[PDB]
Design a protein around this motif. Structure first.
Motif, PDB file in Angstrom:
ATOM      1  N   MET A  65      -2.036 -41.071  31.655  1.00  8.22           N
ATOM      2  CA  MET A  65      -3.144 -41.936  31.208  1.00  8.22           C
ATOM      3  C   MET A  65      -4.984 -41.420  32.409  1.00  8.22           C
ATOM      4  N   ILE A  66      -4.584 -40.122  33.404  1.00 11.18           N
ATOM      5  CA  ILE A  66      -5.696 -39.061  33.372  1.00 11.18           C
ATOM      6  C   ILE A  66      -6.595 -39.069  32.142  1.00 11.18           C
ATOM      7  N   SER A  67      -5.627 -37.877  31.725  1.00 12.45           N
ATOM      8  CA  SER A  67      -6.577 -37.103  30.473  1.00 12.45           C
ATOM      9  C   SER A  67      -7.208 -38.169  29.305  1.00 12.45           C
ATOM     10  N   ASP A  68      -6.795 -39.251  29.503  1.00 13.26           N
ATOM     11  CA  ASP A  68      -7.133 -40.441  28.088  1.00 13.26           C
ATOM     12  C   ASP A  68      -8.267 -40.940  29.167  1.00 13.26           C
ATOM     13  N   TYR A  69      -8.682 -41.429  30.172  1.00 11.93           N
ATOM     14  CA  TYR A  69      -9.974 -41.760  30.358  1.00 11.93           C
ATOM     15  C   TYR A  69     -11.121 -40.662  31.048  1.00 11.93           C
ATOM     16  N   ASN A  70     -10.676 -39.494  30.910  1.00  8.18           N
ATOM     17  CA  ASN A  70     -11.425 -38.659  31.147  1.00  8.18           C
ATOM     18  C   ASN A  70     -12.082 -37.914  29.565  1.00  8.18           C
ATOM     19  N   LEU A  71     -11.402 -38.307  28.602  1.00  9.13           N
ATOM     20  CA  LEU A  71     -11.485 -37.296  26.809  1.00  9.13           C
ATOM     21  C   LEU A  71     -12.751 -39.297  26.882  1.00  9.13           C
ATOM     22  N   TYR A  72     -12.345 -40.391  27.325  1.00  7.36           N
ATOM     23  CA  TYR A  72     -13.160 -41.508  27.069  1.00  7.36           C
ATOM     24  C   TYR A  72     -14.778 -41.599  27.301  1.00  7.36           C
ATOM     25  N   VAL A  73     -14.832 -41.530  28.293  1.00  6.52           N
ATOM     26  CA  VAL A  73     -15.429 -40.903  29.374  1.00  6.52           C
ATOM     27  C   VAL A  73     -16.717 -39.557  28.894  1.00  6.52           C
ATOM     28  N   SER A  74     -16.445 -38.657  28.294  1.00  8.25           N
ATOM     29  CA  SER A  74     -17.166 -37.380  27.882  1.00  8.25           C
ATOM     30  C   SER A  74     -17.428 -38.024  26.605  1.00  8.25           C
ATOM     31  N   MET A  75     -16.330 -38.540  25.454  1.00 10.13           N
ATOM     32  CA  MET A  75     -17.138 -39.226  24.578  1.00 10.13           C
ATOM     33  C   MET A  75     -18.198 -40.083  24.219  1.00 10.13           C
ATOM     34  N   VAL A  76     -17.989 -40.965  24.920  1.00 14.80           N
ATOM     35  CA  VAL A  76     -19.626 -41.713  25.218  1.00 14.80           C
ATOM     36  C   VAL A  76     -21.193 -41.411  25.688  1.00 14.80           C
ATOM     37  N   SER A  77     -20.464 -40.438  26.938  1.00 14.81           N
ATOM     38  CA  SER A  77     -21.420 -39.610  27.311  1.00 14.81           C
ATOM     39  C   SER A  77     -21.769 -39.154  26.437  1.00 14.81           C
ATOM     40  N   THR A  78     -21.987 -38.809  25.532  1.00 15.10           N
ATOM     41  CA  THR A  78     -22.561 -37.976  24.399  1.00 15.10           C
ATOM     42  C   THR A  78     -22.635 -38.101  23.280  1.00 15.10           C
ATOM     43  N   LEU A  79     -22.192 -38.880  22.879  1.00 15.67           N
ATOM     44  CA  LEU A  79     -22.374 -40.251  21.434  1.00 15.67           C
ATOM     45  C   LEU A  79     -24.014 -40.857  22.118  1.00 15.67           C
ATOM     46  N   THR A  80     -24.566 -41.265  23.364  1.00 18.55           N
ATOM     47  CA  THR A  80     -25.475 -41.769  23.926  1.00 18.55           C
ATOM     48  C   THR A  80     -26.595 -40.842  23.861  1.00 18.55           C
ATOM     49  N   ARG A  81     -26.467 -39.764  24.131  1.00 20.37           N
ATOM     50  CA  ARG A  81     -27.606 -38.624  25.061  1.00 20.37           C
ATOM     51  C   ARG A  81     -27.871 -37.741  23.035  1.00 20.37           C
ATOM     52  N   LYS A  82     -27.178 -38.409  22.281  1.00 19.33           N
ATOM     53  CA  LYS A  82     -27.489 -38.112  21.001  1.00 19.33           C
ATOM     54  C   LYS A  82     -28.366 -38.704  20.116  1.00 19.33           C
ATOM     55  N   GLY A  83     -28.081 -39.895  20.981  1.00 22.18           N
ATOM     56  CA  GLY A  83     -28.172 -41.280  20.163  1.00 22.18           C
ATOM     57  C   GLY A  83     -30.424 -40.879  20.364  1.00 22.18           C
ATOM     58  N   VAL A  84     -30.332 -41.151  21.867  1.00 19.98           N
ATOM     59  CA  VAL A  84     -31.623 -41.163  22.630  1.00 19.98           C
ATOM     60  C   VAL A  84     -32.254 -39.605  22.200  1.00 19.98           C
ATOM     61  N   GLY A  85     -31.607 -39.083  21.645  1.00 21.16           N
ATOM     62  CA  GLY A  85     -32.280 -37.772  21.510  1.00 21.16           C
ATOM     63  C   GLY A  85     -32.924 -37.721  19.606  1.00 21.16           C
ATOM     64  N   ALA A  86     -32.332 -38.657  19.210  1.00 23.04           N
ATOM     65  CA  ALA A  86     -32.822 -39.304  17.868  1.00 23.04           C
ATOM     66  C   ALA A  86     -34.404 -40.181  17.992  1.00 23.04           C
ATOM     67  N   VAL A  87     -34.525 -41.166  19.196  1.00 22.12           N
ATOM     68  CA  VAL A  87     -35.515 -41.500  19.527  1.00 22.12           C
ATOM     69  C   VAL A  87     -36.889 -40.241  19.545  1.00 22.12           C
ATOM     70  N   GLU A  88     -36.070 -39.956  20.823  1.00 23.62           N
ATOM     71  CA  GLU A  88     -37.254 -38.753  21.046  1.00 23.62           C
ATOM     72  C   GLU A  88     -37.811 -37.896  19.925  1.00 23.62           C
TER      73      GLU A  88
END
Ligand SMILES: CCCCCCCCCCCCCCCCCC(=O)OC[C@H](COP(=O)(O)O)OC(=O)CCCCCCCCCCCCCCCCC
Ligand SMILES: CCCCCCCCCCCCCCCCCC(=O)OC[C@H](COP(=O)(O)O)OC(=O)CCCCCCCCCCCCCCCCC
Lengths: 90, 78, 75, 68, 76, 60, 75, 77, 90, 68, 77, 59, 75, 75, 90, 79, 89, 51
Positions: free
Chosen positions: O62-85
């Motif tokens: 359970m703790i390994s899945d929580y960690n991977l989920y949040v790392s995924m979302v936090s990476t793709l949002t940063r790529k998303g705003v980087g495109a707009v910049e």
């Protein structure tokens, strides 16, 4: 030695588009990976395989090879993407 | 009103984790027809034992997890 | 295949028959657990096995760590 | 190699040879003690080489980026 | 042709001049007459001395590998 | 290079008679001290030259 | 010099003569192994020596660990 | 119901001493009736000694394989 | 304790222009930096100090303070030069 | 976690059972010999499992951290 | 009542020798009334010596089974 | 401070290494000293890493 | 109470009365140290008490190890 | 004085007089080494003292580990 | 298996504005996350759950899945705003 | 089809903080043992309680550590 | 146990932009200064550095401090980062 | 309506884990044609036991 097969004259009178070369590479890799993960998990579940030295010594090599392969694919992919960014980016 | 209700109720429930219901009671029961203690009959050939009610019952109940009920030959509070 | 399997195999082609001998000696001993002649042989074979399997596994571990270092310095 | 094309021995050989000798008799203390130090020296050599190659490439990448 | 952890092993192997053979000799003699207390008393000494020799050698080479690996790690 | 010399002396005396407890007791200490010294030196060298590299990267 | 050497030498000065009390009581016993007063004398000296060396080594070890853990944080 | 490997190593001993596990209890049930018979004492000394050795060697052997296996599994890291 | 001395009176100077205020701030920082670096180097090679927990606990702080101070001076210098460059380019 | 669209517990009970038999008569050599084996196998199983689950976590984390 | 394996291996001897535990006392209190009768002496000698062997063999058997169990329990760790 | 207390417990012990009462006292003192030194060093490092990170942020 | 307390209490529940029996037999024996029939009983009861406590302790230790080895991997 | 000192001192106060009882009984025994009453009295005291010291040291050991394991995670 | 629910039908896109679909996606993610964090915390305190080898093997996943989920979302949002910049600043 | 949202007990945990039973019981068991260090019935109990307390405390520390690394890694991802 | 609280601390109306800064800056510098002090004197006290129930608290305090200062730094940097782009452009 | 039903249902389920109903009962059964205990008999040279 079990079920070996090789393609011949792969590029001798036909050539794929890059569009397809990438797609075939991706598919051939993704399925091999998923099957290797299942093989490992199954070798861990079976009570007769996790308790025999001969079978454990085989499983250590499988885990080592999986870990090295996925790390090499990831590094090369990242490095190759970087070059296209340095080309396109104004 | 909603916020107050939800908070108050949650605190009532938590504080009642400090209260206790299960006061024990003691029954004293005289046997009218038999000796309470266990007995041993040293037959000249063999020693034989007849256990007492206390021993028998303790041995029967020992390690039970569930409640008792129906000895045979508000709802939240109950 | 791979090089780490090549290293693993370089032991198993080194100890020709031990893998069999151990089980054979065990069957004999199990047939008559109280013969000192049998006991003395089994002690030796079992020890030689324990050592072979430990040396093999630690060597494979070391070569794995050498490769995992190089593939990081590719970056 | 047996080959030169016109136009001593290294740790890579010595390790392969000492492993080869050991695997014939995994329980001899002289051979074990001879192998520990070769496997250690090979591990150190093969780390130090890669780390310095990496330093020289990061220097050249920084130069090219600085003149971008 | 060899490194410096071989110089450190060889300082033991040339330090204890002859023990490596003396053990085999003692065993060759004892094997012939196990019930002799003078042979038994000699072998106990040689075998113990050899056991310590090997342990001290291996732990020293381990420590020098731990110093070197830590310096190399800083080349980054 | 004094602390480099002392350890090689101790090692010779020990290698002469690996079972003498007084020699073992001395060598344990000398080797431990040398071991701490090397690490401390390497780490500070690193810090001092990472600061220079960060300066150059600041104007570069 | 160094600090671990001072720690180690503090024991050597704490027990004044023990390192050569043992060697002397041994030389006395070896002359007449069957004298019970000599046997009883030797048993305590050898015990004391054993404990002395153990304590001496373990303390140097603990101090080493504390120093290595501090030096690890210079980086 | 799943037999591992250690189970098989143990069962090798059980299927080795096919009948000793009964013989010990039957020779005991003879002796306890007439403890003074030399024939019965001589018999029971033997069968008891055998049963001791058998249980001891079995348990040591299982332990050694348990210690090899753990030492391999620790390298999966 | 033994063989120890301190300078009681500092030499003094007039400060009359931004030029002298600048040279003075520069010279004040240079010397403090050289002194600190030398001190640390010695503390790493006196063997009574390399191996004593109380002395190592101090050297750690000295190293940290050095790092922070030089990083601050670098940053603020580069910010000042960048502000000049920005205004003149504009 | 499933790969979306891709086509494609006994040892615990066994150890519990053996424990319950043993607890009733701790002096029976046959119950002792049996429990020793069940407990040893269960121990090895749990260790191998948890090591493997960590190795997969660390590969996924390294991948993400490479592009992050 | 609750009774372990050792208690069982002990009770085997008790239930084995049906009556000797009484007979030694009845022979004793016959003899004590008249120490000089050969027919009483000759019986008592055999009964007392049988009781002796009985207790010894019982105690040694329980000791051996204890030590087999302690040997196995030492390997769980 | 703790530095002196540990130094003195050591001096008393080395006088008679075989006395249980002295050994038990020393085990306790040396243990507490070890924990103290480690906790201190880790906290110092943490604060300095924060301080450095701010500069790296505006640099 | 956790799971270890439960494992521990399985032994205490499996042996109905031994803690009492052993004490009682001790008191009967102490009154008359020389009756062979009092003496033989106590030998057996004390023997079983010994094994019971030994097994109970070693099992708890093993379970503790399996847990601590798992919890090391959370991070 | 920290918490570990407290844990040690709980044993020191939990046994009131044992240390002096041991010191005394030893001197009574040494005055007449052949009296069974004194011998019997001494065996029990020395056994108690042995268990006391062992339990004390093993407990301090465990607590040290729990603390060092927490402190490691400050980083 | 104790209590479960699933949402069967998703509302038609023809009646929902573009920003409603975002609010609705965000809220659902933020709640499933707070609920997982809470669940893990509660597993670590029930003394039955924290000391049983069976249950720990679950908590680790359970703790390994929580960690991977949040790392995924936090990476793709940063790529998303980087495109707009990249598109607007450039 | 999608799994249910769940529902959030927002208030409960932060004020459920309070003196744990477990430490209280550990200290009580130690105080019972120290009165008679040789009773096996008390030793058997204290072994078990001390063991459980060790496991609980480690599991908790490692968990706090994991949850805060995620937050530090997010902030370091955006700066 | 000696404790005090200052209650009438803040004004909730709309207020000039200049003073929202001063009040935020001052309240934050105060909070961090006291937090840091309590951390250090929790380590120096021997009764607190050696109790496993106390260490678990200090761990949380340290981590919360780390995160709070990391976030105030990040948001302030992005704040001035906006202005400098709007003005340069 | 849907959001209320789903929540109240899930919570009632989680609460019912505390309710226990498999309560035990005790029954006394007299024997009319046989003895309750085990019996032991001596044979020619061995015992026989009937449970
Ligand atoms: C102009 C652009 C030209 C190329 C654009 C595609 C960028 C990706 C290139 C990545 C290089 C792959 C290196 C893999 C190294 C390796 O050995 O792995 C082989 C490895 C196994 O090799 P095997 O021995 O053949 O099985 O297979 C792979 O895993 C391949 C990885 C495929 C991932 C590609 C993902 C495509 C995303 C980009 C699509 C966007 C299109 C937009 C075009 C640009 C914008 C205008
Ligand atoms: C002019 C705008 C440039 C700075 C924008 C400040 C935006 C940060 C506000 C924030 O989120 O942190 C609140 C932060 C946390 O407060 P709290 O969350 O309410 O407790 O408050 C502060 O610490 C304010 C720090 C202001 C420091 C910048 C000073 C402005 C430039 C120098 C003046 C000349």
């Amino acid at each position: 030695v079990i079920g070996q097969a090789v393609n011949i004259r792969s590029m001798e009178t036909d050539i794929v588009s890059l569009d397809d070369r990438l797609l075939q590479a991706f598919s051939g890799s993704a399925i091999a990976t998923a099957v290797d993960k299942q093989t490992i998990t199954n070798r861990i579940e079976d009570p007769n395989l996790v308790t025999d030295p001969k079978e454990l010594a085989i499983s250590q090599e499988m885990i080592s090879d999986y870990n090295l392969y996925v790390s090499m694919v990831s590094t090369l992919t990242r490095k190759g993407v970087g070059a296209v960014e340095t080309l396109l980016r104004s | 009103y909603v916020d107050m209700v939800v908070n108050a109720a949650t605190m009532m429930d938590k504080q009642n984790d400090g209260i206790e219901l299960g006061r024990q009671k003691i029954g004293v029961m005289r046997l009218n027809n038999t000796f309470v203690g266990d007995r041993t009959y040293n037959l000249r050939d063999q020693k034989m034992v007849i256990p007492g009610i206390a021993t028998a019952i303790e041995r029967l109940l020992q390690g039970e997890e569930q409640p008792l009920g129906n000895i045979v030959s508000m709802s939240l509070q109950e | 295949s791979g090089y780490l399997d090549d290293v693993s195999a370089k032991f198993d082609t080194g100890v020709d028959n031990l893998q069999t001998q151990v089980t054979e000696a065990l069957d004999k001993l199990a047939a008559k657990p109280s013969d000192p002649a049998l006991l003395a042989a089994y002690q030796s074979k079992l020890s030689e096995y324990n050592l072979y399997r430990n040396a093999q596994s630690n060597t494979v571990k070391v070569f794995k760590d050498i490769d995992a270092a190089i593939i990081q310095n590719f970056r």
